[PDB]
From a paper:
Five members of the [name] family of Cl− channels and Cl−/H+ exchangers, [name], [name]-4, [name]-5, [name]-6 and [name]-7, have critical roles in endosomes and lysosomes, catalyzing the exchange of two Cl− ions for one H+ ion2,10–12. We recently found that the [name], [name]-4 and [name]-5 clade of endosomal [name] transporters requires the accessory β-subunit [name], which we refer to as T9A or its closely related homolog TMEM9B (T9B) for proper activity in cells and animals. To resolve the mechanism by which T9A and T9B regulate the activity of [name], [name]-4 and [name]-5, we determined structures of [name] alone and in complex with T9A, finding that T9A occludes the Cl− ion pathway and that inhibition requires the endolysosomal signaling lipid phosphatidylinositol 3,5-bisphosphate ([name](3,5)P2). Each [name] protomer comprises a cytosolic N-terminal domain (NTD), a transmembrane domain (TMD) and a cytosolic domain (CD).
Analysis of cryo-EM images of [name] in complex with T9A revealed four classes that can be distinguished by the densities corresponding to T9A. We also identified two asymmetric classes in which the densities corresponding to the T9A protomers were incompletely resolved, with the LD and/or CD of T9A being partially or completely disordered. The weak density for these domains suggests that they are more dynamic than the TMD. In addition to [name]/T9A, we observed two classes of the complex in which one or both T9A CDs are disordered. The TMDs are resolved in these classes, indicating that the disordered CDs are present but not bound to [name], which is consistent with immunoprecipitation analysis that demonstrated that the LD and the TMD but not the CD are required for the interaction between [name] and T9A29. The disengagement of the T9A CD exposes the cytosolic entrance to the Cl− ion pathway, indicating that these correspond to disinhibited states. We, therefore, propose that the T9A CD blocks access to the Cl− ion pathway through a ball-and-chain-like mechanism. Densities corresponding to [name](3,5)P2 are also resolved in the asymmetric [name]/T9A reconstructions.
Numbering used by the authors:
A (entry chain A): 78 to 369, 374 to 479, 495 to 737, 745 to 809
B (entry chain C): 78 to 369, 374 to 479, 495 to 737, 745 to 807
C (entry chain B): 23 to 114, 156 to 183
D (entry chain D): 83 to 114
Write the structure that this text describes.
Amino acid sequence: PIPGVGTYDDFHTIDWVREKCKDRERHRRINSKKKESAWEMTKSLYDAWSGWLVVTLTGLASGALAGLIDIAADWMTDLKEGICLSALWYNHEQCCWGSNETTFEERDKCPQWKTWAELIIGQAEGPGSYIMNYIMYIFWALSFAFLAVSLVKVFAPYACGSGIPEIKTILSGFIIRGYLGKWTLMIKTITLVLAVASGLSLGKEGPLVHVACCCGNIFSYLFPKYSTNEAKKREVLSAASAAGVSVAFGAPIGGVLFSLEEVSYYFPLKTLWRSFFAALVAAFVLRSINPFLVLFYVEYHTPWYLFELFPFILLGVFGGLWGAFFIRANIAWCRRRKSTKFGKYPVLEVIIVAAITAVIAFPNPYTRLNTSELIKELFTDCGPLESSSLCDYRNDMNGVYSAIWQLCLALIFKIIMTVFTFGIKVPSGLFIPSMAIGAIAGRIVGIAVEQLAYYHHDWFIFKEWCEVGADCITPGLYAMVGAAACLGGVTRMTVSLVVIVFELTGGLEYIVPLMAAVMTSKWVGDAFGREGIYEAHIRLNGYPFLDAKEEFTHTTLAADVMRPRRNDPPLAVLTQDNMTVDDIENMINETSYNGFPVIMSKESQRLVGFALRRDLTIAIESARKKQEGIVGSSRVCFAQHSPRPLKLRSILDMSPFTVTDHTPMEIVVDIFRKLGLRQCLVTHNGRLLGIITKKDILRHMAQTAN
Amino acid sequence: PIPGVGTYDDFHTIDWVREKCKDRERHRRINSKKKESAWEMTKSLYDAWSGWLVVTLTGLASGALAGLIDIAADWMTDLKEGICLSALWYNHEQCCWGSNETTFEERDKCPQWKTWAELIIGQAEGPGSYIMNYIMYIFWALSFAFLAVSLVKVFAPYACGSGIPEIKTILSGFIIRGYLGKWTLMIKTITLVLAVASGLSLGKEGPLVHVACCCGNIFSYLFPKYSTNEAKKREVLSAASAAGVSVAFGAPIGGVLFSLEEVSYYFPLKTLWRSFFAALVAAFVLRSINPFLVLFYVEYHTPWYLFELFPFILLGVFGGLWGAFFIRANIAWCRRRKSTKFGKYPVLEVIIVAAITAVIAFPNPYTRLNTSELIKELFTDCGPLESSSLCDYRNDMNGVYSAIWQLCLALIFKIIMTVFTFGIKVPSGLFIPSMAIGAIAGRIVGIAVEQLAYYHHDWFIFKEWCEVGADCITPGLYAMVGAAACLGGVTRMTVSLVVIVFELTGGLEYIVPLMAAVMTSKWVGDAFGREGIYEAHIRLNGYPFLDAKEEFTHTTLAADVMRPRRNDPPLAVLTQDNMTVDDIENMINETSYNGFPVIMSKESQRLVGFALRRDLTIAIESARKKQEGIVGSSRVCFAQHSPRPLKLRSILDMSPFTVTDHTPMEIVVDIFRKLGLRQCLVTHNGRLLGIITKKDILRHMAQT
Amino acid sequence: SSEDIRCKCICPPYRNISGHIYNQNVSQKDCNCLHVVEPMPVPGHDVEAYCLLCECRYEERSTTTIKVIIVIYLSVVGALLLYMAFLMLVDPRVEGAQQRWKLQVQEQRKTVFDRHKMLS
Amino acid sequence: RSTTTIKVIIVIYLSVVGALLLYMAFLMLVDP
Ligand SMILES: CC(C)CCC[C@@H](C)[C@H]1CC[C@H]2[C@@H]3CC=C4C[C@@H](O)CC[C@]4(C)[C@H]3CC[C@]12C
Ligand SMILES: CC(C)CCC[C@@H](C)[C@H]1CC[C@H]2[C@@H]3CC=C4C[C@@H](O)CC[C@]4(C)[C@H]3CC[C@]12C
Ligand SMILES: CC(C)CCC[C@@H](C)[C@H]1CC[C@H]2[C@@H]3CC=C4C[C@@H](O)CC[C@]4(C)[C@H]3CC[C@]12C
Ligand SMILES: CC(C)CCC[C@@H](C)[C@H]1CC[C@H]2[C@@H]3CC=C4C[C@@H](O)CC[C@]4(C)[C@H]3CC[C@]12C
Ligand SMILES: [Cl-]
Ligand SMILES: [Cl-]
Ligand SMILES: [Cl-]
Ligand SMILES: [Cl-]
């Protein structure tokens, strides 16, 4: 065919049927040429192994980048508190690694590490030392945020945000050129570390999915099969997203479950094993570099009891409520950023938010602590060896009020910040903030339950389930359940979320409470709204995304959504023969239609096929260059084989999809979703009457929802 | 509409589109009636909770039945060895559980338990005692097998077999009335316990899925939404299959992965959470009943090393090989059963197989021991506390050859027996036999590798990976990997299998070796054939199952598969008006077409709709009963509103799927697979020209 | 590398003596309670009780991995910032690709910064 | 150990098996 045929413009959905057919034709050619020569056999073998090789490369790159990002983010976050003069490449934990001056009270206390007050003021303690530490913390946070936003602006503006919404849209068939490019990969990798160091209420776990998808796209470019075909590249991107989730949470099974559940609009069977393999490879790499097995390992000696389900369900409810609230708040805030002028100053916005978050973060310990470190600490179970402040009250009696007040202040702070932080134009994620909020809430709830059990053991439930004077209640389990509930409420993810949380925990005993809390949070959120944060952001950005949840009214008919309608003039049509090249070029220029139907005759209106505008113009230009005398006067014949007429039957889909006008539009939406149809030609009495496009379907869905 | 309209005959596929439309119409009706009264609101709330309630009931029933079956099977299997006089209701382990006469050499040696020789011969040891134990073991195996096959034949013929292939066909739209009925459920449970007791090379883990599916169907009958609509019932059946796998292996996540990967033809997103929840519920019930949280818990102190991947890969290959062989052997044997006269005597075949199995199993310890128990023993790591014969050689030097010879004999016996034991007319599962074969092979390979490491530690790989004089090798890990490889090769399950093994053994650290072995076994099996055991059995049975792998020839076009073709007469069409009831009934009787197209005129051949033959006859009879004077002379008008003509437009499909003749057949198979259509009407120039059906596509694919 | 490996024993408070942590660079076989702490506060008869209450671990790290990751990340960030300064000040087939990317990044920056609403 | 669980499972399984065999015998002989 003509070079460039079968390609799509930027921001254009792909026709899955046509892409599949192109893949089948390429397979025909490659398989046929195998017997021609041994080199053809080697090429065919490489094509057969192209999928395995691409998933392996994607997993390796995802693991390497995830490990680098994690280590760099940890070091940069620890830079704010102070510096290690002996080893500038060591964070606070690594600087105090070999120190023998450590004490039981302070594990990270060593003369090697020097706080900024010690560097400048020279005093580790004192009002001036605290003032200087505060000022330097704010300064470092602002510097990191400004660097991240500037790098996003100058090089990769698409690098901002989690990217899960745009990945979901892309896997549905949408095309966003440059989203998965080299520049976006590099800039996002750097700015993720920068933003995480800045201390903003965001996480790097979610954006790792987009990073992995970028790696997968770059690797798909190497293999011809996955480069020519958009659907094949999207399968590779689903595998890449699974690998990204795996590296983010160390959960390969959870990664595959998330990829199937959320991002992958179409999930063939072979994608399942490919995604699992890629996730395993990436996790193995991360374990090879990042350690220096379970990131959030928990040791709750007492098993979860049935009555504990009641508090857990409450956490679930909370996980839903906040979730819904956030989906109502952030979107609105984001919407304002699109309508008001405060979105016209993105660097100023990020700098301001970093200033406020650092200012409100330094005073409190939990808020100042890194979000991932805070989640880990909240997950840890209290023990005699532990010196955590959270358990101080348990040591005192067995200040609880002081710890609960600090946790509540941290919860309020994080909840307020996360709304503004998401939508800010640096690589940000919702997994870590939501997990931190839910963990704080669960720790508060678990502390309350433990206090109730210890103070009141006469209650029959407490006495029967827990021995008198026994610490059956484990705050870490409650924190885990709260984190799972909040994440399920905000994301509306049920199975992938539960499996990811279990893998990150490393314990299968807590599957039932986690599922119960996630189900309760999802149900509460659905009561307050059936759209998740990712779906809500997709709708806010107005991307062409079609979902199974959306449906049309029974009164809607294919005639109603037909493009020509009444006010619109008759849809552009192309006569099979007796038409000049100039006519086709003028029609292409005049109309923005993705494609034009080709009919046997203008009066007959008997459809022959569908000619895409891109394919038509590409073929016309290539024929003009190839063959002389094509000044536009020569006619074009779409029928099967001096004027030297141009032939455009090759670029014509000889088998266009067709539905009848009295067909309910519900069936049309089902066909579009199942077959991934770009357009469908509504014909009456065997003659063309109109066209329904996926864009038309989305527009009428938006009108109904609006 | 007319009562009975939209129903499907036995052994007939459903059209997912009509079922979805019916479900949405019912949803609209319920939502509209909600405001009418408070009781309507309560009914709608119950309808909303119908899915959760039905999956909960399915999970509870699956867990209870799985626990019951497991305990009864254990007790019955221990029945063959002997009886506990002090407790006629404990098995061998339970009878000696509290005995103070237990010895280190024999853990299950207690006076309360008495072997059949003690009951009859009176001497625990001696040639006569051994002979009497042998004959009593054979007799008990024969009795159990005969009773199982008799119960299968007399009451529930569908109880025979694992049922996973038939569940695949059902979840693809096929209908087998009675497969998921109460009779099948009960007979399947009883005969599963009996067959496992008999000692045949079969397992209850796979058939537990079908038990769960039967429970799910029975519960679906309770809730109107899922009973009325076939697709909704199939979603419940997918959840039931997930719960069944969960109870079978205590692997909820693995159960959902199996449901998505293998049995569920269409898997909606909501069904994902429903299946996982049902699996967790069933696992909770099983944990509450069967124990008295990992069935095959393993403790491998030494982590797997990179070089060990090479033996694991080898195991993979072996699995694949065996896999292929079985899919080439069993099917053939099964085909012989369908072609020859030994299939006319299923009871005799079952009895003979049980006799041979018991006779060859008693002499050897591994084969005599229950297959699940043998797998568990193989998975256990050798240690000083362990007194297993497999590790005796390790206790000696650190008879290896004798233990390896016994393991090889057990492997050969199991491989031969599974070929003749799968497909017989009793509930049989391939999971346990495949796992046992792979575990024996992996244990042999691991013992060999341990011997190589100990004898030759000078090798740079061994010295670097393992300290000199250290038991880095873990035979249990190799057995686990071999079992996973064999199961993957025979079933061609990749992710669900790996997660199931991980949850069955609770070992996440060994995920990578299992993945590598399963991938290798699947790839060799594909080299020998892309179809697994279940797909091969579906093809052998002749069920109408369509898979994504199947595709048509590239010169094929819609016209080629069109029903009328050339030799066949023009496909029957019904005139919209001026057509009699008698003539429609005569057309229904004349042809066995699933449905006839309805055209506005014979000459024009302009398709108006598609009226199902079953729906047409049901409507005609119902109208005859309802309205007098319909003796067949009255005309039938399919067009929109003395003769009092019958109106069949309601039962007519106003918008049937249509595809142009020039359309390649492969586009048509993609359409059919995606939308699950029963038939599509090929029309040329806007006029009906032919009809393609799911059966036409399946027949043409089979011919190719 | 001594800094790469150590062994640490942390002991919670026992009777009179409060909890204490002792660290030393020793091998795994040498890594144990009686070796890491020398001498100990508790008496001889209670020494075993204190050790049992105390928990000991042998820890190892890969300082080279952290060093290389930090160094390469810093080098990439510095090169990116130098290129940013080049674009901000100096700029006012590889060259063809770079200018094409300049146009593409201008387009993406207009979509993502100026409007925030990219629909097509 | 949960002796009562094995108790009930074994007893009810035996009862159901006996009932099924009795029904089979009746169908074989009594039903004719
Ligand atoms: C083109 C892309 C996919 C290539 C990416 C290759 C990456 C994954 C490679 C390059 C260098 C590699 C590392 C080199 C050295 C070691 C030390 C060894 O004791 C553990 C593995 C480890 C830490 C490797 C892990 C994988 C690694 C990071
Ligand atoms: C209609 C169907 C779904 C109902 C099935 C109900 C089943 C699942 C019920 C009936 C009796 C129940 C058992 C009754 C008693 C006990 C003892 C308790 O210490 C643990 C739970 C356990 C072991 C229950 C498990 C669930 C159980 C087996
Ligand atoms: C097909 C299955 C369900 C039938 C199971 C029936 C079993 C349990 C029955 C059948 C024959 C029975 C035995 C027959 C005779 C005796 C002698 C008596 O002094 C002690 C009990 C003992 C040893 C019985 C134990 C139970 C027994 C083994
Ligand atoms: C945006 C990110 C990547 C930049 C990171 C650069 C950091 C690590 C740099 C910037 C300024 C540097 C400090 C500047 C001055 C001194 C005084 C000297 O006697 C010891 C080192 C010390 C204390 C430096 C340590 C490293 C330092 C904090
Ligand atoms: Cl995140
Ligand atoms: Cl995110
Ligand atoms: Cl089985
Ligand atoms: Cl099976």
